[PDB]
């Protein structure tokens with residue numbers, strides 16, 4: 081049998097038949113569940129993955145079992161036998177990147193998974209050309225505030241040659257300077273990469289919102305430093321619709337969330353450099369990036385300016401300040417005409433995705449703990465939706481830091 | 484093989500060695516995680532009974548002793564004579580506390596050592612059931628200074644029926660279905676409201692009509708008992724600065740007293756064992772009053788707050804919820820009824836995790852239920868990795884008696 085899955089707001093019940101096809105294994109066993117852990121973790125095996133991928137492709141275009149389907153299978157079979165690897169067709173790479181997004185269990189934004197611009201950078205041959213490809217990505221995806229989802233795919237891993245890597249975890253990151261107390265000026269999430277940036281010749285700053293340079297790695301080659309042109313990096317100054325002093329906090333965030341440190345895996349090929357980007361959900365900025373105690377940690381500062389009683393928890397000063405910070409983020413992005421989505425609309429759209437995917441594939445891999453937003457969880461519909469978490473391929477995967 | 488568990492705020496690391504002693508199997512496999520699902524022989528009885536007796540004696544440091552061997556031989560002879568056995572009253576107290584301490588979805592477990600255990604195993608008939616319950620409610624409420632308590636009715640045994648409390652809680656508001664199709668009252672209790680009506684009770688017409696009690700002696704049909712209104716402490720809800728909030732007519736009850744779960748100790752099963760604590764404010768203010776399938780008052784409150792409800796990005800839902808939770812905390816404190824806010828409760832759970840790490844090498848915890856339903860990441864438990872597994876003694880869900 082297949083896991084029965086229930087929505088408790090509405091009473092509806094589905095069965096996730098797709099989960100039976102989970103190839104790779106997660107961290108849970110019948111004896112104990114580890115679903116809350118942040119990081120859970122041969123021509124023959126390559127071929128069954130490639131085969132399965134090719135089968136997925138030909139199903140998506142409703143030409144399963146066709147002459148072209150059998151010929152492509154045979155072609156991949158013969159190329160793996162001759163060379164130990166194979167090359168994707170362009171249309172397969174596009175389909176593969178969209179499937180990896182569609183399969184990501186921790187992404188609430190997957191209603192968009194079919195609108196993804198895929199830049200083929202598989203002919204890239206240097207760190208310098210890499211930088212050109214990334215700048216075109218940022219330009220296209222920013223679109224002067226009307227943000228567009230995109231992925232740029234650099235050459236696949238292959239034996240006898242080092243990987244392309246982007247060392248930065250995102251294309252746009254703020255510097256995090258280790259003050260000597262152990263404190264930090266700027267973003268503490270970025271202390272390691274900031275120091276590697278300086279270790280490699282970047283002249284630092286001392287502001288809180290200093291955009292980091294990119295550390296780009298060509299095969300068998302130390303990383304090279306590249307400064308982003310300031311007009312390529314769209315930023316939003318934060319202000320609050322009614323709390324005028326808020327603007328004096330001097331807060332900013334960048335428009336484009338572009339993750340650059342994950343591995344794209346398609347039919348057994350691995351792409352260690354394939355940055356992808358969408359647009360922000362406001363709670364990522366307002367609640368996590370600004371209010372996490374180990375990020376910018378502004379919550380007490382705002383609550384005091386709001387004149388709340390911060391000496392007892394029962395006044396809910398924390399909740400009130402966080403709500404207003406999230407209001408500032410939404411108001412500020414809308415005022416700047418930069419795409420943003422709030423957690424209520426985002427989770428509503430995700431519920432539509434679950435319904436589409438149940439029809440299309442008989443299920444959807446989803447990580448409840450990551451889909452429910454970090455404030456107001458039970459106020460969104462995903463809170464009341466049971467979910468099944470499992471790993472399908474194509475996939476985006478975490479990978480070791482290249483240093 | 485022992486799971487590594489990290490706190491990402493502090494960066495600290497522990498290993499949960501207790502998860503190795505997981506007696507039952509949960510719903511997850513290497514292929515798929517089902518952690519977010521709400522509802523996941525004499526030789527068999529003996530091995531469970533022996534495991535619990537071994538547990539108890541190791542916990543009182545006098546194990547492998549004469550009293551330890553004496554007790555093991557007694558339970559073996561009991562089950563051979565009768566098919567079951569009797570818990571010594573101290574074993575029953577220890578087993579009830581362990582079942583609380585082992586409950587993965589309870590954020591209030593810092594209090595697990597402080598539990599009043601009322602032994603009602605000498606109970607027969609539903610009228611005595613009702614008197615035990617009323618003594619529980621009276622003791623647990625304590626004029627607003629709430630005290631944790633459990634009352635244990637006779638265990639299931641072969642051939643004989645069971646004591647059951649058909650109500651999911653001792654205090655529940657009626658849910659009346661309408662011609663409109665809507666429910667007046669609590670939608671959660673539509674089923675038990677119509678059971679109470681069928682078994683005699685003449686219904687009210689209010690949004691907060693306290694239900695009667697449907698208590699079932701073994702084999703006999705259930706009997707309808709009214710609760711003395713002076714026993715059922717309630718809190719009218721007002722807000723410290725929104726003067727109109729009082730006029731919404733909202734209220735809630737003091738005692739969270741769950742009466743439909745089954746207590747399992749040493750292979751023994753107590754299908755009636757109501758237990759109560761005190762409320763975390765988010766259970767009332769967020770879940771009970773704001774869930775779309777409960778009272779669903781969010782938009783009513785936002786309209787009175789003159790919020791812009793035609794767009795989500797105003798966060799009118801978030802603002803109304805926070806103020807509804809303020810009103811709960813204010814109303815309970817002003818009424819001198821015990822209540823804990825979600826910040827205080829998650830801070831204490833973090834302490835409980837640290838105590839349990841030293842006490843026995845870990846703690847089963849259900850992250851999705853420990854993290855509060857508003858302001859999740861503002862609480863320290865959001866950043867704490869957790870391991871969920873089943874230990875015995877335990878509280879378990881059980882099928883409806885009907």
Ligand code: HEM
Nearest residue numbers: 181184186187188189192229230356357358359360361476
């Ligand atoms: C278009 C709008 C999008 C929105 C609103 C969105 C939203 C989100 C959010 C809120 C998260 C959780 C992040 C966190 O908690 O730090 C997430 C994770 C993720 N997103 Fe999306 N996303 C979007 C587009 C995309 C695109 C275009 C891709 C790839 C093509 C993608 C792939 C992923 C993946 C793989 C994760 C999980 C990574 C991990 O395991 O940590 N998303 N997304």
Ligand code: HEM
Nearest residue numbers: 583586588589590591594631632758759760761762763878
């Ligand atoms: C003393 C103050 C207590 C507080 C603040 C507290 C808090 C909570 C909360 C917030 C939940 C989640 C329930 C929900 O979301 O509906 C819960 C569940 C639970 N509590 Fe506690 N609790 C307390 C006392 C107790 C006591 C005395 C017992 C038993 C003797 C107990 C056993 C349980 C169990 C078994 C569950 C989970 C039931 C299930 O699996 O659904 N708690 N508690």
Ligand SMILES: Cc1cc(N)nc2cc(-c3ccc(CN)cc3O)c(F)cc12
Nearest residue numbers: 186189337339356357358359360361364
């Ligand atoms: C594509 C996309 C859009 C968005 N709006 N947000 C994202 C957030 C993440 C993320 C960041 C940091 C971490 C590390 N905690 C985990 C993530 O999933 C991501 F990869 C992709 C995102």
Ligand SMILES: Cc1cc(N)nc2cc(-c3ccc(CN)cc3O)c(F)cc12
Nearest residue numbers: 588591739741758759760761762763766
């Ligand atoms: C003992 C105790 C204290 C408290 N403050 N709250 C509780 C809440 C519950 C609960 C209610 C309803 C449901 C059904 N959704 C699940 C529960 O865990 C419980 F059993 C015991 C509680």
Ligand SMILES: C[C@H](O)[C@H](O)[C@H]1CNc2nc(N)[nH]c(=O)c2N1
Nearest residue numbers: 116117449450451865866867868
């Ligand atoms: C420990 C816990 O699982 C961890 O902090 C997770 C929980 N859920 C999350 N959900 C999202 N979307 N993003 C996160 O970073 C996290 N963190």
Ligand SMILES: C[C@H](O)[C@H](O)[C@H]1CNc2nc(N)[nH]c(=O)c2N1
Nearest residue numbers: 463464465466519520521851852
């Ligand atoms: C499907 C999901 O597990 C379900 O809605 C859970 C989530 N977390 C919860 N957490 C608590 N404390 N109480 C609940 O009822 C729930 N519901």
Ligand SMILES: [Ca+2]
Nearest residue numbers: 159166167168
């Ligand atoms: Ca070729």
Ligand SMILES: [Ca+2]
Nearest residue numbers: 661662663664
């Ligand atoms: Ca009609």
Ligand SMILES: [Cl-]
Nearest residue numbers: 337364365369
């Ligand atoms: Cl981010």
Ligand SMILES: [Cl-]
Nearest residue numbers: 739766767771
């Ligand atoms: Cl409740």
Ligand SMILES: [Gd]
Nearest residue numbers: 321322323324
């Ligand atoms: Gd103002």
Ligand SMILES: [Gd]
Nearest residue numbers: 786787788789
């Ligand atoms: Gd008015």
Ligand SMILES: [Zn+2]
Nearest residue numbers: 108113511516
């Ligand atoms: Zn699991």
